[PDB]
Every structure is written in C-alpha cells, then in structure tokens.
C-alpha cells in the first residue's frame, strides 16, 4: 500500500508468468477465469463488461488504485473476502511495483 514506480519490462515478464493465466490487458480483449483488465485502473471494482463477479468483489466496490492495487495483490482473499480469484498473491514489494507499472500503461 506504498507502490513506487518500477521495472515495466519485469513487470510484463511478470504479467506473463503471473497473470496472463487469468486474464488480458487489451482493450475488447476476452475474459479468461478472470476479467480482462483494460480501463481498470480509476474504476470501481466489478465492472468489466461482460464479466460476471462474485458479490464480493462487487460488494467492495474499490476505486482502483496503485495502491490498494498492490495492497489486493499481495493477498487478494484477504483484501475482498469471499473472492473467486484463486490466486494467492505476490509477496514481494519490488514484484508487486514492477507489475503494477507494466498494467498502468498495459491497461491505459
Ligand atoms: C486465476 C488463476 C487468476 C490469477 C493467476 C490471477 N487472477 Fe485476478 N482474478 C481472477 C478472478 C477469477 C477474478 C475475479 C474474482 C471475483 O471475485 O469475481 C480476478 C480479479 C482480479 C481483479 C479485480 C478485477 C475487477 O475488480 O474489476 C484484478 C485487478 C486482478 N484480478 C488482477 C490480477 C493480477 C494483477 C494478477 C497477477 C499478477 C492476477 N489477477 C492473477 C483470477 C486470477
């Protein structure tokens, strides 16, 4: 919940190894498990278009931030309880600023 700008081309290795399993940046981009990410970024949770949520993560109702972002994803059950995203988190700080500076821009 402090992120600094970091790593975009670690960040996208990270997307890859990470992410991509569930999900995809570009915009009309196809919803996989999760939902595609474009415009998520300064939007309220659970409005990717298309995608059905949980009540949870629609019951948070976050407005996306770098912050809270990292903060989510370094534990995302915890963040939004009753959660689908089977995904368990990035730990590392320096992990979660690389990966975060790539989607500002991947989703943008
Ligand atoms: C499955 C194997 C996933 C992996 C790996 C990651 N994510 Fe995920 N994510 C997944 C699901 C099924 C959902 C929906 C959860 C629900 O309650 O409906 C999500 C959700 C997100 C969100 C929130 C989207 C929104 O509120 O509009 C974000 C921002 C998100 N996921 C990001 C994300 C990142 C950055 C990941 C890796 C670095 C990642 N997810 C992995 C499924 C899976």
């Known amino acids: 919940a402090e992120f ?7 960040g996208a290795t990270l997307f890859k ?8 940046v570009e915009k009309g981009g196809p919803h996989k498990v999760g939902p595609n990410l474009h415009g998520i970024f300064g939007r309220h949770s659970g409005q ?17 931030d770098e912050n809270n972002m990292s903060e989510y994803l370094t534990n ?6 009753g959660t689908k995203m089977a995904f368990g988190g ?5 992990d979660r600023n ?6 500002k821009k991947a989703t943008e």
């Open 4 to 10: 600094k700008a970091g790593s975009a081309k670690k």
């Open 17 to 24: 190894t990470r992410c991509l399993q569930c999900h995809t």
């Open 48 to 64: 990717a278009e298309g995608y059905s949520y949980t009540d949870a993560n629609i019951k948070k109702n976050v407005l996306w």
């Open 76 to 81: 995302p059950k915890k963040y939004i309880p």
């Open 90 to 94: 990035l730990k590392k700080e320096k």
């Open 98 to 103: 690389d990966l975060i500076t790539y989607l």
